[PDB]
Design an enzyme around this catalytic site. Sequence first.
Site, mmCIF file in Angstrom:
data_model
loop_
_atom_site.group_PDB
_atom_site.id
_atom_site.type_symbol
_atom_site.label_atom_id
_atom_site.label_comp_id
_atom_site.label_asym_id
_atom_site.label_seq_id
_atom_site.Cartn_x
_atom_site.Cartn_y
_atom_site.Cartn_z
ATOM 1 N N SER A 31 -0.743 27.016 -4.275
ATOM 2 C CA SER A 31 -0.517 28.446 -4.565
ATOM 3 C C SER A 31 -1.174 28.897 -5.868
ATOM 4 O O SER A 31 -1.821 29.947 -5.912
ATOM 5 C CB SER A 31 0.986 28.766 -4.627
ATOM 6 O OG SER A 31 1.510 28.676 -3.268
ATOM 7 N N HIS B 37 13.864 12.091 14.290
ATOM 8 C CA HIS B 37 12.562 12.038 14.948
ATOM 9 C C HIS B 37 11.753 10.829 14.515
ATOM 10 O O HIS B 37 10.715 10.549 15.146
ATOM 11 C CB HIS B 37 11.737 13.352 14.709
ATOM 12 C CG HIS B 37 11.306 13.610 13.309
ATOM 13 N ND1 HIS B 37 11.387 14.888 12.797
ATOM 14 C CD2 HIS B 37 10.755 12.830 12.337
ATOM 15 C CE1 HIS B 37 10.917 14.888 11.555
ATOM 16 N NE2 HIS B 37 10.559 13.654 11.222
ATOM 17 N N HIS B 38 12.279 10.036 13.574
ATOM 18 C CA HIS B 38 11.707 8.720 13.253
ATOM 19 C C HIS B 38 12.310 7.647 14.135
ATOM 20 O O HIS B 38 12.030 6.458 13.921
ATOM 21 C CB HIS B 38 11.956 8.380 11.763
ATOM 22 C CG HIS B 38 11.217 9.335 10.865
ATOM 23 N ND1 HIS B 38 9.876 9.123 10.593
ATOM 24 C CD2 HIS B 38 11.552 10.524 10.275
ATOM 25 C CE1 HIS B 38 9.402 10.153 9.896
ATOM 26 N NE2 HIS B 38 10.399 11.001 9.685
ATOM 27 N N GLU C 125 11.951 12.780 1.758
ATOM 28 C CA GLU C 125 10.884 12.237 0.914
ATOM 29 C C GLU C 125 9.503 12.818 1.263
ATOM 30 O O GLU C 125 8.694 13.027 0.352
ATOM 31 C CB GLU C 125 10.870 10.693 1.077
ATOM 32 C CG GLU C 125 9.684 10.075 0.341
ATOM 33 C CD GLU C 125 9.743 10.217 -1.203
ATOM 34 O OE1 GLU C 125 10.736 10.638 -1.803
ATOM 35 O OE2 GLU C 125 8.678 9.939 -1.853
ATOM 36 N N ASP D 118 10.698 22.482 -24.447
ATOM 37 C CA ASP D 118 10.551 21.154 -23.886
ATOM 38 C C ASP D 118 11.444 21.125 -22.651
ATOM 39 O O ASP D 118 11.858 22.179 -22.172
ATOM 40 C CB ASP D 118 10.970 20.011 -24.855
ATOM 41 C CG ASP D 118 10.193 18.722 -24.560
ATOM 42 O OD1 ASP D 118 10.615 17.986 -23.640
ATOM 43 O OD2 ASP D 118 9.135 18.515 -25.223
ATOM 44 N N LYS E 119 3.511 29.915 4.788
ATOM 45 C CA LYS E 119 2.775 29.572 3.567
ATOM 46 C C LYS E 119 1.266 29.503 3.832
ATOM 47 O O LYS E 119 0.472 29.915 3.007
ATOM 48 C CB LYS E 119 3.225 28.224 3.021
ATOM 49 C CG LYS E 119 4.751 28.247 2.661
ATOM 50 C CD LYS E 119 5.203 27.017 1.805
ATOM 51 C CE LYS E 119 4.617 26.990 0.345
ATOM 52 N NZ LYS E 119 4.951 28.292 -0.427
ATOM 53 N N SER F 187 14.896 6.486 -11.767
ATOM 54 C CA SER F 187 13.903 7.277 -12.516
ATOM 55 C C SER F 187 13.828 8.692 -11.957
ATOM 56 O O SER F 187 13.896 9.681 -12.680
ATOM 57 C CB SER F 187 12.529 6.572 -12.410
ATOM 58 O OG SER F 187 11.561 7.508 -12.939
ATOM 59 N N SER F 188 13.718 8.811 -10.624
ATOM 60 C CA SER F 188 13.552 10.132 -10.008
ATOM 61 C C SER F 188 14.840 10.929 -9.927
ATOM 62 O O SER F 188 14.777 12.167 -9.983
ATOM 63 C CB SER F 188 12.989 10.011 -8.575
ATOM 64 O OG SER F 188 11.587 9.738 -8.641
ATOM 65 N N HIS G 195 12.801 11.346 5.595
ATOM 66 C CA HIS G 195 12.197 12.653 5.888
ATOM 67 C C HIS G 195 12.226 13.611 4.710
ATOM 68 O O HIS G 195 11.151 14.129 4.347
ATOM 69 C CB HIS G 195 12.767 13.344 7.152
ATOM 70 C CG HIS G 195 11.932 14.555 7.389
ATOM 71 N ND1 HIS G 195 10.721 14.458 8.059
ATOM 72 C CD2 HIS G 195 11.869 15.725 6.714
ATOM 73 C CE1 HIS G 195 10.021 15.564 7.913
ATOM 74 N NE2 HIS G 195 10.708 16.346 7.091
ATOM 75 N N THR H 129 6.417 26.899 7.343
ATOM 76 C CA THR H 129 5.184 26.324 6.835
ATOM 77 C C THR H 129 4.023 27.237 7.168
ATOM 78 O O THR H 129 3.117 27.396 6.349
ATOM 79 C CB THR H 129 4.946 24.933 7.444
ATOM 80 O OG1 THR H 129 6.115 24.153 7.220
ATOM 81 C CG2 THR H 129 3.797 24.262 6.647
ATOM 82 N N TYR I 240 8.776 15.729 2.412
ATOM 83 C CA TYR I 240 8.724 17.081 1.830
ATOM 84 C C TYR I 240 8.676 17.041 0.293
ATOM 85 O O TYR I 240 8.040 17.896 -0.333
ATOM 86 C CB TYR I 240 9.903 17.924 2.393
ATOM 87 C CG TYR I 240 9.699 18.039 3.892
ATOM 88 C CD1 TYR I 240 8.700 18.897 4.394
ATOM 89 C CD2 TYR I 240 10.382 17.198 4.820
ATOM 90 C CE1 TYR I 240 8.363 18.920 5.767
ATOM 91 C CE2 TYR I 240 10.064 17.269 6.163
ATOM 92 C CZ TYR I 240 9.083 18.098 6.646
ATOM 93 O OH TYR I 240 8.720 18.169 7.965
ATOM 94 N N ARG J 281 0.383 0.625 15.519
ATOM 95 C CA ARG J 281 0.188 0.438 14.093
ATOM 96 C C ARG J 281 0.738 -0.936 13.674
ATOM 97 O O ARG J 281 1.372 -1.658 14.457
ATOM 98 C CB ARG J 281 0.849 1.595 13.272
ATOM 99 C CG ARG J 281 2.327 1.632 13.455
ATOM 100 C CD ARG J 281 2.872 3.034 12.955
ATOM 101 N NE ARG J 281 2.996 2.973 11.479
ATOM 102 C CZ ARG J 281 3.822 3.771 10.775
ATOM 103 N NH1 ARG J 281 4.496 4.753 11.387
ATOM 104 N NH2 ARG J 281 3.967 3.565 9.475
ATOM 105 N N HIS K 140 0.831 -1.211 0.000
ATOM 106 C CA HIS K 140 0.000 0.000 0.000
ATOM 107 C C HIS K 140 0.863 1.257 0.000
ATOM 108 O O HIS K 140 0.635 2.189 -0.797
ATOM 109 C CB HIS K 140 -0.951 -0.021 1.211
ATOM 110 C CG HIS K 140 -1.583 1.304 1.558
ATOM 111 N ND1 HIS K 140 -2.454 2.000 0.721
ATOM 112 C CD2 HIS K 140 -1.461 2.045 2.689
ATOM 113 C CE1 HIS K 140 -2.834 3.118 1.329
ATOM 114 N NE2 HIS K 140 -2.243 3.166 2.527
ATOM 115 N N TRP L 83 6.975 -0.382 4.969
ATOM 116 C CA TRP L 83 7.678 0.249 3.827
ATOM 117 C C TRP L 83 9.082 0.745 4.224
ATOM 118 O O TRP L 83 9.830 1.159 3.358
ATOM 119 C CB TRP L 83 6.847 1.393 3.236
ATOM 120 C CG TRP L 83 6.950 2.707 3.945
ATOM 121 C CD1 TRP L 83 6.412 3.023 5.172
ATOM 122 C CD2 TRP L 83 7.623 3.888 3.481
ATOM 123 N NE1 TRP L 83 6.723 4.357 5.490
ATOM 124 C CE2 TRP L 83 7.432 4.898 4.453
ATOM 125 C CE3 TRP L 83 8.350 4.203 2.304
ATOM 126 C CZ2 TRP L 83 7.995 6.186 4.335
ATOM 127 C CZ3 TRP L 83 8.881 5.501 2.149
ATOM 128 C CH2 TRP L 83 8.713 6.481 3.175
#
Lengths: 259, 94, 514, 46, 49, 79, 58, 227, 144, 105, 84, 73, 43
Positions: free
Chosen positions: C255, C290-291, C242, C91, C319, C156-157, C240, C316, C244, C438, C61, C126
């Site tokens: 925006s 913090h994880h 990731e 392009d 924003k 890819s990324s 982390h 944040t 963001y 969890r 998932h 995951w």
Amino acid sequence: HQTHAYHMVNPSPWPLTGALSALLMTSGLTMWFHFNSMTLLMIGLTTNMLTMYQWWRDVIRESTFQGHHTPAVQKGLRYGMILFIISEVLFFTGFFWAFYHSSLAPTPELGGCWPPTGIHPLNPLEVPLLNTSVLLASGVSITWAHHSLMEGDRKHMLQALFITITLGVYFTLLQASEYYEAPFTISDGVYGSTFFVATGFHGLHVIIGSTFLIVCFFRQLKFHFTSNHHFGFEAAAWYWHFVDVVWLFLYVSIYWWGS
Amino acid sequence: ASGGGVPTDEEQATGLEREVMLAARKGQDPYNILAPKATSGTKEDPNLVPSITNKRIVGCICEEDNSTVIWFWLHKGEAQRCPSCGTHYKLVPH
Amino acid sequence: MFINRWLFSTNHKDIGTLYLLFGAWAGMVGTALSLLIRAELGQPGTLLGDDQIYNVVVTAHAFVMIFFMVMPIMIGGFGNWLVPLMIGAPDMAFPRMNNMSFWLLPPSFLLLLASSMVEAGAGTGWTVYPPLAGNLAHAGASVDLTIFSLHLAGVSSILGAINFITTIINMKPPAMSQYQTPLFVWSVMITAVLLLLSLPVLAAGITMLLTDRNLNTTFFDPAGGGDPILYQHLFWFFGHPEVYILILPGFGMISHIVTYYSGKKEPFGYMGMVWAMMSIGFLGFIVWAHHMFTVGMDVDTRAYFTSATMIIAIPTGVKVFSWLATLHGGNIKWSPAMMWALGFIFLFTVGGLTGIVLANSSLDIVLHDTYYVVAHFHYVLSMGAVFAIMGGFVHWFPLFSGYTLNDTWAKIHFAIMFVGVNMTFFPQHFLGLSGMPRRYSDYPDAYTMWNTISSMGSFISLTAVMLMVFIIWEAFASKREVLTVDLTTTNLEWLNGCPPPYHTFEEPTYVNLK
Amino acid sequence: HYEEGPGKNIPFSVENKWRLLAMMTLFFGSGFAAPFFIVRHQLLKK
Amino acid sequence: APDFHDKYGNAVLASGATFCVAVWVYMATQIGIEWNPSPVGRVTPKEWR
Amino acid sequence: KIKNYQTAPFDSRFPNQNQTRNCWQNYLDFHRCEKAMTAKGGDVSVCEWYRRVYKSLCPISWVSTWDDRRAEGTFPGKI
Amino acid sequence: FENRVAEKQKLFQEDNGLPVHLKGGATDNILYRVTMTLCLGGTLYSLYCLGWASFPHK
Amino acid sequence: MAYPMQLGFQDATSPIMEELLHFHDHTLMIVFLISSLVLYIISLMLTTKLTHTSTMDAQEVETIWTILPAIILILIALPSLRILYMMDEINNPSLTVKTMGHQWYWSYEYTDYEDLSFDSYMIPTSELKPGELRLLEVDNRVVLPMEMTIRMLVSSEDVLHSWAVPSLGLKTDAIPGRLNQTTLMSSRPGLYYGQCSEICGSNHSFMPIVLELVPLKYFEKWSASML
Amino acid sequence: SVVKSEDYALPSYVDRRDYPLPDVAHVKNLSASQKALKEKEKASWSSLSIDEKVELYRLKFKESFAEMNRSTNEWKTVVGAAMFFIGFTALLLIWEKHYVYGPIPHTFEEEWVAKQTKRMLDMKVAPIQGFSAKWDYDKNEWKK
Amino acid sequence: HETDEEFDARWVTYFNKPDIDAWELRKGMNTLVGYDLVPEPKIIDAALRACRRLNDFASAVRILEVVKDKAGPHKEIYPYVIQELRPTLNELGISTPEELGLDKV
Amino acid sequence: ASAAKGDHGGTGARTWRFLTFGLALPSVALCTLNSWLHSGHRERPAFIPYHHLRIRTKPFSWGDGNHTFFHNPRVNPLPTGYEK
Amino acid sequence: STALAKPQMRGLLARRLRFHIVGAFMVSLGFATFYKFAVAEKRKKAYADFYRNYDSMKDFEEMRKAGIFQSAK
Amino acid sequence: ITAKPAKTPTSPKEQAIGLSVTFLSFLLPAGWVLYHLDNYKKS
Ligand code: HEA
Ligand SMILES: CCCCC/C=C\C/C=C\C/C=C\C/C=C\CCCC(=O)O[C@H](COC(=O)CCCCCCCCCCCCCCCCC)COP(=O)(O)OCCN
Ligand SMILES: CCCCCC/C=C\CCCCCCCCCC(=O)O[C@H](COC(=O)CCCCCCCCCCCCCCC)COP(=O)(O)OC[C@@H](O)CO
Ligand SMILES: CCCCCCCCCCO[C@@H]1O[C@H](CO)[C@@H](O[C@H]2O[C@H](CO)[C@@H](O)[C@H](O)[C@H]2O)[C@H](O)[C@H]1O
Ligand SMILES: CCCCCCCCCCO[C@@H]1O[C@H](CO)[C@@H](O[C@H]2O[C@H](CO)[C@@H](O)[C@H](O)[C@H]2O)[C@H](O)[C@H]1O
Ligand SMILES: C[C@H](CCC(=O)O)[C@H]1CC[C@H]2[C@@H]3[C@H](O)C[C@@H]4C[C@H](O)CC[C@]4(C)[C@H]3C[C@H](O)[C@]12C
Ligand code: CUA
Ligand SMILES: [Cu+2]
Ligand SMILES: [Mg+2]
Ligand code: NA
Ligand code: NA
Ligand SMILES: [Zn+2]
């Protein structure tokens, strides 16, 4: 008809063959690790090499032979190569972090010391020092090759680039011999793990960078480079300096400080 | 020592790269590498916008350092005005 | 012609379309997996009778939703369609490498499917922590197929990041500085920098896991002097950044959406918005542990990571308040995309605030590995990233297709989804505060009421997803062709019509310097 | 060149809305069905 | 000229609301779902040991 | 400064949540002391503090594995 | 050696509509067909291997 | 343990857990206020036909929206960190107990004096005694003296696990090769329940923790009888 | 009148209360009588009839402010249809309960719950606020 | 930065330019209605007279509509502005939207 | 900072060739000398079956599963000791 | 017969904003007071009252007599 | 946005067909698997 300076690339099959070569290499490693078979892996390695060859061939056709590399296009390729090198630096950073994590806090299983009990490191003043002099020397010779090309000197560009490549090959043969002679292996706990995976990925990058220099050598023999336009050579030199700097960090960290 | 044997761009550049090089020597910019410098932008002295067709998009940075660019099609014919600041633009096809 | 156009593409719009189709298909897979999760939990006892399968469903998932739905839709889809148009570029910088970023993703997804079909699947979470993911507790090919899936998605990324950074730096009009590019373009550039730096570290960590599983290394195995916690550091040094990466393009789309349906020519406080996204991206690299507040780290390290994490609220907040200040004085158009963006502002704020709760490592001892974390991140992902995606999709569907949606149906869709996700996830706060872990397939009886409600919520969101597909069908079935779009003077991507021609900006825009 | 315009810049046809319905049904339906059949597969293996 | 919402909006609102309440109340009360509410004020405690 | 032992006291050398090295160091100290005593003819009773601390802190399987490796000649710490 | 870049420039700029990956001539077509056959055949074989590996065997 | 329809934390059993409740109340008040302020301002922006669409100067108002959140974060961090360091403070235990995670059960070792150790497995649902709690009871509980500072040391002999007891505010990951320390002090007798809190495979859901807190003299006699 | 796809790059008409004077007239082509009306507009507007004034307005603009700003009954359709689909969802949930879910564990039987409730009170579960705090141990009943 | 009277005077001067063209009339009104205010009668007067010089009756009516719109729920502003404009409306023969039935939906 | 030299003024190919042949390659030659004077096998240590070394959690995917990829029989013992 | 007075015509949106941001602030203070009383102080007093005369041995003996313990009968 | 009237209008009856087919495409295959779960678990 365009009135900007950028390159609209012809529709190309190599992205798809490259992506499928990735599928075949990874499913092939899986088949090799778990189903005792090399077949898929060998197909994937072959299609990967074919893809790289035709793709970069086409880039040479687009630039040297068709003229699409305006200054704006070249500037993009400069950014692209710099960013690619930065991602490779961060890839190596993970392996250095693994090395410092394990060696700064050696666990009881190791004897609570670094190097671990029963590990006899290579002497960093013997072949590792020779390898350091070899790659540093090649960074001097590739710089000579670059200035000869800018000064329009075909013979000395070829000579210096050949010396650079010979040194890259010397490093690779020395490292291969060191791997065979080493009394510790990749299965010798975290010492062997960090040593071989980090120097092993570095050695792979030396082979890649040497191949790239060899491509530049034959392009030079065929007069592709002008004295002002030769980004493939510049990119190979940047990559080669990156390989040299990674080596200096490995030498200081793993071979010297880690001994 | 120092011999030759390396081609120059003058000798060997081709295609679009060569067009850009030769135009730059003439001080010309057919492939839009440089930013055009503004005129005063009045109706008497409009910004002259080259085009190979009969309309081109203009982006107007109305005041220095505005982050908002104002975009509009400029068509062949009478000068048009930026809808935000009014500065004038006139298409010069070919 | 079909093969040349759709398999050999070098066109940023067609590749963006491929990404949107891929991400929508992945979203169906990820949604089905989420419904299996909630079906297992929807009453006490066991549904699957196989918790290894439950764990495989949870793991897949997450990978599907993150790597095959959100990132391909936001960066591959909206990024490729919109970024070149928003800077007037013809392009992407590397239009052919761009096509390989796309075509690496079907094989990556195929590897992840293979992982779940062979042996007993990768029932790892995951995070793929060893030693559960190692070759004794997960013997056989499933975890290695997962690792290779991640390797291909990562390449890819990374190449996509190189493409986007180069395009955005190098291919703007010569008069346009970086402070004259739209906020969505900024959001993509910053996301790409985060991808470039973080994914190689994940690649290093999962390669070490691959060699511990297959080459007898011991990076993570104490028997060889290794350490499971080293893997967690490498994983979360990527993980982390990731999250963001998952939200920043959403911030960029929000925006544009809020500005557009407020009838404004510009967002409020543009340079503050740029500053905030840059600050978030920078701080996103110095908070990862913090994880790991329950793994046994020293107290001073816990104090540092608490404090650094809380600092992210300041940019944040700029924003969020700047979005509110963009609405302020607007001629508000209550379009469906506006509803998605307004839902985003509020629900993202709720989720960000529960993230601030979790940043406090003292309280995180009791909340870690409970449903309070699950509630937190589904507010920012299911009601922030997904609401930004839906807002962007409804807003730009007429640009990409040339056809309009039925706005009444789109509003109905929003209403159903809003009820469903809130019924699903709000009660999970109570489950987390009261201690439900969890990654569980069943729970002590006390937890039944909120799990029942949460699972009923998940079915409401299913109905919304089914209706989304019908709504897309009805638009293509009815063929209402776009005529006029307002505010094109501040929304350049619309100025070439709907859909824009295959080649746009063959003649570049004229922008002077003055 | 390639076809351009609404309905032409996509890899699937929208010329007939009922054929389109079939194709979209197969497309989104296959993605949504797959996890259910993966679970069935794993259940039936043991 | 009246549109769909002028013609059918009242019926859609009334019928949808009536249907929604009816089916959720039925689901919640008539098919054996165990909500497991609090015993407080509800359950008489019984000797267990 | 003899008995009254309840459990291992706070040790400023090991003030953090990871107590692995505390177990290991006291195990080493006990066995180094015992080796010194049994050699020169003395009494292992002088080693007792280290014995109580490592028995308190160390998982039984760790002690057992370390004892087996000492017997095998594969213990990697210095005693 | 001699500089034959001009000949190659004439070849690859010939107005024949060919994409750059085929514009060298018949050898390009052969190499392309070999590459694509290996890729597509290898991919089908990978799917066969998935099918085999998806079921318990020995 | 949790009880049906519970909204918040389990009642505190230890002083540190009481501190966490008051700190959570403080933080949740701030969370509610900010979320409600944002929802209200949204509604305010959206409920007028008055407009103002020309460019708005941002400088002045961004000082408020950075400084006021910074002050609020400091007002969260100050008590947050106070509790963190109070947790860490030197406590001087009078007992050390080890627990080792396993797939899928916990073992306990009490080796300050004698070699006492045993395994602790979930009671299967089909074997619960009437009135016992599904998925939470164990065969052999972790008996401990009440009103005493206890050092728990946590590790694993296979994969990661995590040893948690919410009402005492405890959660310490169980990592092979590592010995993690936490301290436990129950203000009351009774039975306090927790569940494995790091995914450890197919029976992660089914290896719970039950502490049984009693007077020292009972703990001593129990210990002796478990040898 | 008729707006064409191929007109996308030309100035266009819009009815927006915040852009009151759009870039083009709503009607560009004039009949003979409309041309005569535009000539008459060059004379005193007091000489135009009401109908002529409305016609000039409707040549320039499509909808008035009141027309473009009108509210609609759409909300009824949206809310009602949303409730319909939420109601449909409960049918799916009814189907799931009937055909997918088997019985829940025996610990939810009434007698089990009564015994388990007493045992929770005997171990003083959450005695400060959450649970046993709500039981009156002196009167042996739930507090009022 | 600028007094109310100075702002209003600039806008009166803008519309009073004798040879103001159609583009400038639209630019003026479309810019003006972005501000947080209902324009003073003296501004609207100058704009309506610009409409007259440009032979544009319809834009004069539209300008009255946008005064009413900018007032939002403040129902007292538009009848006050029309009251103050009555001499100009009479002089120029400008019918209000209400007199034209254009306030009906 | 540096070690001491000179050069400069408009550095180019001639100077970098000077550095290649005058400093870099002589240094490689000296390190090659130093290495081939310290070459020659050292005595392999007693075998001790340490449990943190010679790790085998899965057979290697080549050979008999028990030999590392660049196994050197002279200096790399198997888990059971040196080969004969 | 009567003319209408000149109403305020300028700054109506800003005036509305000011008024309601002030009101939001006042409500926020009113809520913080309610929440301190209804939640935070309530909890402090519940724990303080619970423990003020709490007898842990008596609690234990009640639990023991109810039969809940493995170690104490 | 403005737009042209539909080139191929989709009537209420047509929308009901498209919606029903869409929903059945999601519900029937998953419903079949979940209905038969016990049969799979008995293997
Ligand atoms: C889009 C994805 C996303 C985003 C953007 C965030 C944003 C944040 N997250 Fe979240 N998070 C996840 C996705 C995300 N997270 C995921 C997936 C996990 C679980 C990983 C796993 O274990 O699987 C997770 C887990 C996670 C943890 C670990 C908890 C644990 O496992 O025990 C923590 C801890 O600090 C954390 C904190 C935060 C914080 C502080 C932010 C901040 O960036 C939020 C900032 C926003 C606001 C604060 C709201 C707006 C601000 C204002 C209105 C201003 C005023 C506010 C204040 C003064 C407070 N997150
Ligand atoms: C020789 C001189 C030059 C040195 C480099 C030579 C070739 C290296 C090639 C590639 C290396 C890349 C992966 C590194 C993995 C480990 C190899 C490390 C280097 C090496 O070659 O290590 C050898 C072991 O190789 C082994 O296990 C088996 C090695 C073969 C199988 C490797 C399979 C793993 C591939 C994983 C690739 C993942 C890539 C991910 C990139 C992601 C990007 C986003 C060491 O031999 P030994 O007998 O143990 O000790 C010597 C005793 N006398
Ligand atoms: C066991 C061994 C396995 C090995 C597998 C890999 C094998 C080796 C690959 C080696 C790399 C060869 C790269 C050759 C590129 C040739 C094309 C080229 O160099 O193209 C140049 C552009 O550069 C460009 O695209 C630059 C393009 C970027 C090239 C980047 C190459 C390095 C990256 C390779 C992949 C590394 C992956 C490592 C992962 C762990 C062409 O422009 P110019 O030179 O200016 O010419 C034009 C003038 O003639 C005009 O006057
Ligand atoms: C995407 C990146 C992928 C990285 C590329 C990985 C390529 C791996 C190729 C490995 O090739 C293996 O090398 C072994 C060398 O040890 C061979 O051992 C062979 O030869 C040995 C002696 O030379 C003996 O152990 C055996 O006879 C025999 O297995 C083995 O067969 C051969 O297949
Ligand atoms: C989480 C996602 C799932 C959400 C809910 C799905 C809602 C249900 C859709 C209907 O699914 C069908 O239900 C039938 C039962 O109503 C099944 O027929 C089954 O039962 C019938 C009646 O007992 C028999 O006639 C059939 O042969 C037998 O297959 C049938 O196979 C299945 O396709
Ligand atoms: C043939 C070519 C002359 C330049 C040209 O006219 O082609 C010469 C000039 C530089 C020469 C190369 C360089 O001197 C470097 C190498 C020197 C080695 O001694 C022989 C191979 C070596 C690789 C040479 C091969 C060949 O003789 C080259 C390539
Ligand atoms: Cu043990 Cu989870
Ligand atoms: Cu995080
Ligand atoms: Mg955890
Ligand atoms: Na160069
Ligand atoms: Na369950
Ligand atoms: Zn302008």
